[PDB]
A paper describes a structure:
The crystal structures of the HAUSP TRAF-like domain in complex with p53 and MDM2 peptides, determined at 2.3-Å and 1.7-Å resolutions, respectively, reveal that the MDM2 peptide recognizes the same surface groove in HAUSP as that recognized by p53 but mediates more extensive interactions. Structure-based sequence alignment of the three HAUSP-binding peptides revealed a conserved four-residue binding motif with the consensus sequence of (Ø/E)-G-(Ø/G)-S, where Ø denotes a non-polar residue.
After many unsuccessful trials, we once again succeeded by engineering a chimeric protein with the MDM2 peptide (residues 223–232) fused to the C-terminus of the HAUSP TRAF-like domain (residues 53–197). In the structure of the HAUSP–MDM2 fusion protein, the MDM2 peptide (residues 223–230) is bound to the shallow surface groove on one side of the β-sandwich in the TRAF-like domain, the same site where p53 binds. Five residues in the MDM2 peptide, Asp225-Ala226-Gly227-Val228-Ser229, make extensive polar and non-polar interactions with the surface-binding residues from all four strands, particularly strand β7. At the N-terminal end of the MDM2 peptide, the carboxylate side chain of Asp225 accepts a charge-stabilized hydrogen bond from the guanidinium group of Arg152 in HAUSP. The main-chain groups of Gly227 in MDM2 make two hydrogen bonds to Gly166 in HAUSP, whereas the backbone Cα atom of Gly227 is within van der Waals–contact distance of the hydrophobic side chain of Trp165 in HAUSP. At the C-terminal end of the MDM2 peptide, Ser229 in MDM2 makes a total of three hydrogen bonds to surface residues in HAUSP. Compared to p53, the more extensive interactions between MDM2 and HAUSP provide a mechanistic explanation to our biochemical observation that MDM2 out-competed excess p53 for binding to HAUSP.
Author numbering: 63 to 105, 113 to 205
The structure:
């Protein structure tokens, strides 16, 4: 259900080499809030952020999350590149991630295993509000 406490979801960006703007993945619900992967070029590195409830018109929400942002390596998963984040998402800071997740030249290098048919796959494993739960 949308009330699950954790989830893993991927977002593939096609024609990556041509990417000239910021793109958003469709939503993945965790603890009933919409989480999305945000990717964009940064001045060259790949910007990779996790967004939560960005379209809410209320300031009365929060999500204490721990997540792993990863760019998958089709050839050898052991070679996929990951970075962890920990953040209390709320209206003033509803996305969190790395403006310099990886060098653009390193991710687009066809001999590195992060791009196939000009496609790069981003993945996020997110756990929300695990500090909250039933008393027993």
């Amino acid at each position: 259900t949308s009330w699950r406490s954790e989830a893993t979801f991927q977002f593939t960006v096609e024609r990556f080499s041509r990417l000239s703007e910021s793109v958003l993945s469709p939503p993945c619900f965790v603890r009933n809030l919409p989480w999305k992967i945000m990717v964009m070029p940064r001045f060259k590195s790949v910007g990779f952020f996790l967004q939560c409830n960005a379209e809410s018109d209320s300031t009365s929400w929060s999500c204490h999350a721990q997540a792993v942002l990863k760019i998958i390596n089709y050839r050898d998963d052991e070679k996929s590149f990951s970075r962890r984040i920990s953040h209390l998402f709320f209206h003033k800071e509803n996305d969190w991630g790395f403006s310099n997740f990886m060098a653009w030249s390193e991710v687009t290098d066809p001999e590195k295993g992060f791009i196939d048919d000009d496609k790069v796959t981003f993945e996020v494993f997110v756990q929300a509000d695990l500090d909250a739960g039933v008393s027993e």
